[PDB]
Amino acid sequence: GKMFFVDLSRCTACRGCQIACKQWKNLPAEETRNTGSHQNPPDLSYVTLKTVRFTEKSRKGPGIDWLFFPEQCRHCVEPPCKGQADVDLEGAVVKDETTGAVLFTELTAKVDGESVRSACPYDIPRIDPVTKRLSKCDMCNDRVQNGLLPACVKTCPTGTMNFGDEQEMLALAEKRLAEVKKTYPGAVLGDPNDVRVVYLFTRDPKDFYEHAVA
Amino acid sequence: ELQKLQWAKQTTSICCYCAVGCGLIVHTAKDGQGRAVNVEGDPDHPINEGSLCPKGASIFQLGENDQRGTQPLYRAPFSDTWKPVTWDFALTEIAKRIKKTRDASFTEKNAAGDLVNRTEAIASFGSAAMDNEECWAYGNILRSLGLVYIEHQARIXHSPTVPALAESFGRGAMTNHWNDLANSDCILIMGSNAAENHPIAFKWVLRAKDKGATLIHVDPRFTRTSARCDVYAPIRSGADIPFLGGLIKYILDNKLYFTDYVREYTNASLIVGEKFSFKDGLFSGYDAANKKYDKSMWAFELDANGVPKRDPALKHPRCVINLLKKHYERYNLDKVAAITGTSKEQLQQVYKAYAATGKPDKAGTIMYAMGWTHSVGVQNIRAMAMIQLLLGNIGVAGGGVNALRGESNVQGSTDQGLLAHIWPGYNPVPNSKAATLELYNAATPQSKDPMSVNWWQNRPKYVASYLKALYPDEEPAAAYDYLPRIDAGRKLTDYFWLNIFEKMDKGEFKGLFAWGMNPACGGANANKNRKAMGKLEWLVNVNLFENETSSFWKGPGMNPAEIGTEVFFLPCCVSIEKEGSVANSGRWMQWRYRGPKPYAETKPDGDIMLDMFKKVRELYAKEGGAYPAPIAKLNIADWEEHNEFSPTKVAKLMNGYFLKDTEVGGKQFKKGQQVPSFAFLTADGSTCSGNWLHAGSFTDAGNLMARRDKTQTPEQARIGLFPNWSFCWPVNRRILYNRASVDKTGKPWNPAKAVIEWKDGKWVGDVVDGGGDPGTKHPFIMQTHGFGALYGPGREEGPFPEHYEPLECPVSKNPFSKQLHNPVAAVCDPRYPFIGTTYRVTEHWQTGLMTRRCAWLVEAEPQIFCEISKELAKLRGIGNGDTVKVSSLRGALEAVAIVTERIRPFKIEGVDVHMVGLPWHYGWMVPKNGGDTANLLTPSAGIPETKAFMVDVRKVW
Ligand SMILES: Nc1nc2c(c(=O)[nH]1)N[C@H]1C(S)=C(S)[C@@H](COP(=O)(O)OP(=O)(O)OC[C@H]3O[C@@H](n4cnc5c(=O)[nH]c(N)nc54)[C@H](O)[C@@H]3O)O[C@H]1N2
Ligand SMILES: Nc1nc2c(c(=O)[nH]1)N[C@H]1C(S)=C(S)[C@@H](COP(=O)(O)OP(=O)(O)OC[C@H]3O[C@@H](n4cnc5c(=O)[nH]c(N)nc54)[C@H](O)[C@@H]3O)O[C@H]1N2
Ligand code: SF4
Ligand code: SF4
Ligand code: SF4
Ligand code: SF4
Ligand SMILES: [S]
Ligand SMILES: [W+6]
Fold this sequence. Notes:
The complex is a heterodimer.
Chain A: E1 2-7, H1 16-25, E2 51-58, E3 64-71, H2 80-85, E4 93-95, E5 102-104, H3 113-119, E6 126-127, E7 134-135, H4 141-145, H5 151-155, E8 161-165, H6 166-180, E9 188-189, E10 197-201, H7 205-208
Parallel strand pairs in A: 1-10
Antiparallel strand pairs in A: 1-8, 2-3, 4-5, 6-7, 9-10
Chain B: E1 9-14, E2 23-28, H1 29-32, E3 36-41, H2 54-57, H3 59-63, E4 73-75, E5 83-84, H4 87-105, E6 107-109, E7 115-118, E8 122-125, H5 132-144, E9 150-151, H6 155-169, E10 186-190, H7 194-197, H8 201-210, E11 214-218, E12 231-233, H9 240-253, H10 259-265, E13 278-279, E14 282-283, E15 286-287, E16 292-293, H11 320-327, H12 333-340, H13 344-355, E17 364-368, H14 377-390, E18 401-403, H15 410-415, H16 437-442, H17 459-470, H18 476-479, H19 497-505, E19 511-515, H20 519-522, H21 526-532, E20 538-543, E21 566-571, E22 580-583, E23 588-592, H22 605-623, H23 629-633, E24 640-641, E25 644-645, H24 647-655, E26 662-664, E27 667-669, E28 698-699, E29 702-703, H25 714-719, E30 727-728, E31 756-759, E32 762-765, E33 834-839, H26 855-860, E34 865-868, H27 870-875, E35 883-887, E36 892-899, E37 906-907, E38 912-913, E39 915-919, E40 949-955
Helix pairs in contact in B: 4-22, 5-22, 5-24, 6-14, 9-12, 9-13, 9-14, 19-21
PDB class: oxidoreductase
Keywords: Formate, CO2, Molybdenum and Tungsten enzymes, DMSO reductase family, electron transport, oxidoreductase
Assembly: dimeric
């Protein structure tokens, strides 16, 4: 299988990943407005598969801890969204055995879109108010199958986004956590046994986003 | 196979935004016959390695955009709407307006009776966005027509940077390059928001950290850069010179300077004349009435030969180093802390971290871009250069003054002399007193020092070779009379950006070229400028989309019916729809190729400007008119292939070729051969070259700018020179002043990060910056005396940076002298008590003309905002996300309030002073509810003031 290692201690919130996702899939842009934040779009939706979340936490002395979270589907090893979806219709949510990608097919119109989002402990799935189909990050399975990096991984300049085989990524995450701890001593890996998107957080994952971990 | 990319032709490009120069791969439908289907990063490109920030990442949405211009548009005097017209009509009518204005205003001889052969009735703005070949051709077209008011983007950064670094090092350019940031042991980012404004640069900043480096951000605001640094140090706006002055004193007090480097390679040892002194914030030779200095009073004491006297013992009290120590004694931590608002603890921390790079086997780099670099902005950068010379960080891997250029080709556009004071290759524009070519060449200072290379002594070869590229059938001395001259008697700054807007408002301009710029948003005091454009008879706008400049006449508060300005809007093609080169901040001149054909009836800038000129030439050939010679004889046949502008042919003319069989440097050269280096150019007319800096870029071996070869020696690969990827001027010297990186033996100071090394009779690694055996030449070959200048007696404000207060309104006290404000230099209306500042975000570009048309970037940053502290929010009863009115003496606008701890009140003379932050990326044109330019608020009072202007911020209910 394949795995994303996301080192958030290197993220500059450039949002190259956010734009690159929409470029590769030719997705449309939402109607957005500024409500007192750089964060936009404010949430994932049918047409936004990745958004960078901004969070400001007060620290002692000058400046802040500015916490950046490029949110995507975790592509869980044991997908709860599949388990729930398979109660309505088996096929709607399938698992690629090559890559480990959790993929929503066109049969997600048939299943209960509401409850399959509830089952997701990361609150990832989003419903089309029209076709009633579920959309999210598909791990750019298209590109991964063809021995290319996902768009968000390739576009990232900082070395935040890393992609490859589960073994060599977990090996990287452990070695990187060791060096990052010297700068951010409260650094941790998010659910490194349950998912294929392993986020390195500089501090309490709940500070980055409510559904940052299970 | 990936279906989206299957069947599409794959070509390479370079990003059309910032000066990092990120590689793209473009996929073009129908094997190159149709539209672009995909644009993403070039994985083989050694700067970005496939990475793109959201601007580069969104270039597909820029190019394949149905809001883009399709054909020329015309607007008749007082017309309420655009009238779509053909190219033939637009260029023809444009060519007639030029001739009408030229003939009517062309002055052969100024009042004083001196030859000038110029027009002062036509001005041109732009552009750093055009290809290098297009910038060169444009400059020459404008100069053949006799224009002197020729400016672009570069002015805002040039005026501070180039004179600061030229004075210090002998060249004005970024000393190192992006990949080299990775070799640095301490990175000081100060007057830069690189994480947002040069994003791919942070690939190499973070890799510097991985290998042990400390990253320091010095900024009044906490940014996305600050979040990824080891040390965030807040600084009060305009307290930079105090801060750097404290660092100089810290380095000298604690003996942290690189002694051998300083004694040999800087001017530390040179004896300043007895006439030099400093007292009460004034240097010697001050004229109180005129408010300027007699710089002869700052001269060096010359020996019998005429060479500045030196004490290698550094004992003489008039040694530069000893006068430096004296001058900066006053910048103690207590005074610097009080004025900067930086804690003594953090100052000591930052000072200790960075001055540790004075170690011969450690390298420190300073990164600055625009920041706030006003009256003493030149002296700010001088202090950075002086710190780097003290620590011996100039010429070494991970060192240098990395003065980050803004636009993709602002380096190239400057190199092609699209500023009023310079021809291509930084040969000055002649003034009225420079009556002959011999007199022009007489102005170059000479050195009697045999160790001093003084390379600028070759200038006559470059000027002659230049005039032979434009006018190859004439003698250089004869051709010299064709090109216009500025008034020797007038201030140089009267020909610059800010006075072009002043003159325009006084209706002293008939015509303006707005070529790849948006003045109506870019210019400070937008209300004034938008009204001033109404006083033009004709305006030529060449851009990708309809914009605030093209359509100023139907702008906010405007009435088309009573605006008589005749506008031609010519739609140019995007970067991926044409071939050519762009020169990045690191001087990497990078060849890119056509993907899709020009969208609709759009044209490359080369074809627009060349076709426009040919129609002007045609009119003069049939009608005659004012002094036709320069227009008639200009060699545009070398610019053209298959009835079209040839990027390839212009690039070969810019590199240059021998016009006859010539013997140079004791080597035979055949006629028609490409000149292989500027070393082999001549003054006798044997050679031509559009730009001597390009001599070496396109040789008989081919187009070196189009090299995509990642081949590196171990010592090259250790510091990421990539000398076989594209070509950088001068002659592929990737790190400038690299002779300073080795002792008089030729051994590196830092063998683990060698730039050059003397091995077996040759320099190995980078190309040596100046030929000659180890210890036989002074390392700064473009300097007259050959030394890194700690003492700079050519600067208007004095030979040492001194704190003079740039932030007028809230400051009354200078703790360093009697002299509050700059002695060679605002209303402060109490109704506007806050410091307005303007800056960028990652997702938008310049005035936003380009990025406001890209839906994915509008998605991320849809509206103008006003960032304010929690303290100012509490004072003015503003909540996060509330609509506010920001106002000044110049205008007012509405924006969304972002309340953030990233902004903190300045503490100035026992008072809380609140700073108000606005993005200048917005304009009335597009999008809906996006907002208008923050330059509605900025004052006019030759560079505009955009970082500190007075505002009020009120909540709107
Ligand atoms: N995303 C993006 N990138 C760009 C551009 C763009 O529009 N958008 N434009 C390009 C251009 S033309 C240029 S010139 C460069 C400019 O690049 P930068 O110079 O990085 O641009 P700014 O964000 O205007 O200013 C940088 C920082 O200076 C800080 N600053 C303000 N006043 C002071 C002061 O008195 N002292 C110090 N030390 N810092 C101060 C601001 O808070 C800001 O964080 O960016 C280029 N790249
Ligand atoms: N308040 C405030 N004002 C500022 C600044 C600030 O920080 N604050 N920054 C100042 C600085 S540093 C600068 S450099 C200026 C920049 O100001 P401008 O240069 O006037 O701004 P833009 O026009 O947005 O710059 C990019 C332009 O290049 C055009 N372009 C792109 N590709 C091409 C091409 O191939 N051909 C042609 N012909 N045009 C092309 C784009 O369409 C766009 O119009 O703004 C200055 N103004
Ligand atoms: S993160 Fe949610 S949507 Fe994605 S695979 Fe896991 S359960 Fe399914
Ligand atoms: S992996 Fe692909 S689909 Fe998922 S967020 Fe990244 S670019 Fe978008
Ligand atoms: S591209 Fe990389 S650095 Fe930029 S926001 Fe995405 S993850 Fe962060
Ligand atoms: S905008 Fe600058 S940093 Fe971003 S992709 Fe383009 S060249 Fe690279
Ligand atoms: S620029
Ligand atoms: W700029």
